[model samples]
Target: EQESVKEFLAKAKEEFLKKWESPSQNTAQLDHFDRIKTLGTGSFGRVMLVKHKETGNHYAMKILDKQKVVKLKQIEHTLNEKRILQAVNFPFLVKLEFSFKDNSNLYMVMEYVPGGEMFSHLRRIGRFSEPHARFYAAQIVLTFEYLHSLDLIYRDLKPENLLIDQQGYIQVTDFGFAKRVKGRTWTLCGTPEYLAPEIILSKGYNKAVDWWALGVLIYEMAAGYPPFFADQPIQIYEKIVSGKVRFPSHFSSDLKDLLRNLLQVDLTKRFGNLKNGVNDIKNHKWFATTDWIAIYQRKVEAPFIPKFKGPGDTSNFDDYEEEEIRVSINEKCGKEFTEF
Candidate 1:
């Protein structure tokens, strides 16, 4: 299965690159869309809901300040995200439709997910049933399998990075922390609650970190919060490094078994880092009834589909203030971003 998928990915990457290399009559630009509303914001940039002036199609346009990005020393990660987005083609992953840059800002236009972040929905329901949690986590597993096949590691995994589509399926968003590594990477990046012990201990880590995060995500989905909790980020790290997680009494025996293997602090003993790799996670007793192919083909019914009248609806998203991009780039800094 891994060998076959590698061939499929090879062909997909070739075709996608060729198509993007050749300019089309409808090539998108910043002026091609009218900004509707602010969808989300981060320290470096904000995502805006925009409607194409010509086709009336909606897209989420991410605008980042070049000067700020350089100051923050995220140029490599920012550019690598564009490359990864172009290379990856999966059902559960977001696709990059258009990417362009100006003298001051860089813009990336992607398909708009109207259902919004899974974080808000989790907050609404407090916690999900075992079946609901399995439904979403199954898709993420397939996504990880696909990415890991290409040697790409999704360093960040959290509810906020996952968007629920109309069908309630997850579309993993935000690729700033994702990278393709041959063996291992030593970067310390990820949410505090999801960070693996190896990362906090300054050890060279690999895809194992993502599996660790999956454990945290599953726990959060089922328990309504991460297993490790604290008022400060350092406290959370302390708990994670200690490798002690107390499960609620309501958790089933099989669920407890799965989390134990996934949350193992020792990489050699971790579930996904073992000989069978991700197969151990997929074939665990907790997921015994799951059909991997059905989940990938969208045959499984999601627990809850989001309700929205139109594709341009923004009711599910929180309000963010519109702000101006006020920054400039110098010749040396501009040279680093010419490929954008």
Candidate 2:
């Protein structure tokens, strides 16, 4: 059943051409993709579930308006995020399949993970068992290890930023706050409750901050809420800075110890910030049973299986602003976006 020589050459040529012609970027018009539905929106831009008209591929396109971006003063920030997304090849990290810009909008075509946000699933289920929390946390540990190796700090880590793939595995997404740093950065960014004390105090932070956020995220998953829950932002910041974390009595001592070290107020003593580096967290008793190699290869069994009917099932997604499309002004906006 060997292939014909002519067919082999044709397919090999096509593959070689693909290697040189990047699929992740171009100057093609927005009409290249047929709009499907609004995936989500924020101050920066809206993401759309679209199908490429030519290739017939599904993608989550992040469309940013030029004037809106300039007015928001996020040009550099936007570009940084796109570069990180485009450069990443990790399976647990969200994939950017294509990106392009026109005069009006910046478009990023990304893989559409259909299992929805881990946040929604967490809220629906109330709280996770210790092993359940460990399962998700282990995947994030791998992600953090990978990201930190590249000298990038993932300032944003939360259930909302963690999307479940169709296999119920975690896929870390949204790099709007992710930044590359040589050592420490003074920017005060991240969800208030998840902020490390260093960030709240403007004392600067490094990859250690992500470990802190991971601790907050684990607490929420295990307890159904943030450890520093408060009615006001000020109160939340106060609690975070004070390092006063009170675990629910139901939380086991081992898990509590893990959280305590992760939420350590002193950076020098932080679990993942130690001399041993990420190994300190990976080797912790909480994740002792997690085979690091198996976790990376997606061999670990997920605690819960999603009820997705197929690749495109979005039943786990909430009722969204279904009609808010992102490319309306792609062809009409006056500004050009060539810098990206």
Candidate 3:
């Protein structure tokens, strides 16, 4: 299994890298594209759908406020995100076309995945069946495997951060909290409910934290809500640290056992952190029949194909208020983002 995984990793790196050659920063300016609509909003700025004037290709333009990013002390994370985006190219991960900077904002032109966020579908469906949950879970597992192989830890793993493409496969979006950790990191980050016990206790953690988050994601996918959940954030962290998950009565035994192993508070006992590493999770009874290679290649069909007329469709995203797109100027902060 390990040998095959190594082979697969090599093939993936070579194949995907070749697919998008020379993903370096471009000479394209902000006016090179016409803004179509707002996709979503974030702490730094908002993402907009735009069409390139020359190529007529639809792209998701991430507009980041330089001043806001610096004020929030997210400069380090912003730079890391840009580096990671330029470096990575995977079937299930979003791709960055190129990035440019203006006086007020840093612009990232990325592949506009029209299927929108996985959170919307999960919300509409309330809960997913075993087969549906397994489909997405398997893709996420492989994505995690690929990242972990490079010692890259994706600190944020939630439905909201996952976007669906036209093929309906999952594409990881946000990289604000993702980092390359050779050993362990002590930063306190991630959603409260998805936080690993070690993270909450201020004990430096490794990629094991992502495994714990995977368990939380799977639970939410299958049961319509998180396993360790509460109305308040404080209570939610308490529940996560306690590490007692109340499984729904209808959950299958195989899935329950798998969740238990992944959600284990003891790092030694956790499935992904165990001696076999991610193989333990892959070989579990719950994912016994999964074809990892097929899933990675996207040969398997997705559970649901998002509704969209064409590549430029924006129906999947929610309608934000019609507010003017404006940002205060700060040359000092803008200078900080010049490297982008």
TM-score of every model?
A: 0.93, 0.88, 0.93
Q: In angstroms, how far off is 33's CA in candidate 1?
A: 1.0
Q: After superposition, how far is residue 212 of candidate 1 from its true place, in Å?
A: 0.3
Q: Candidate 1's residue-wise lDDT over 59-81, tens digit each? A: 99888877778888789888777
Candidate 1 worst ten-residue window by lDDT: 19-28
Residue lDDT tens for model 2, 235-332? 99899988688999999888999999999999899988988888788878888788877877888888877778865565776556765444453354
Whole-model lDDT, candidate 2?
0.80
- As for candidate 1, its clashing pairs are none
Which is better, 1 or 2, measured by lDDT? 1
lDDT of each: 0.86, 0.80, 0.85
lDDT of candidate 3 over 235-298, digit per residue (tens)? 8888888868899998999999999998999987898888888899888999987998899889
Candidate 3 off by > 4 Å: 10-23, 323-330
- The candidate, 1 or 3, that scores higher on lDDT is 1
Error of 2 at 187 (Å): 2.1
Summed over model 1, clashes come to 0
- What global local distance difference test value does model 3 have? 0.85
Off by over 4 Å in 1: 1-27, 325-332
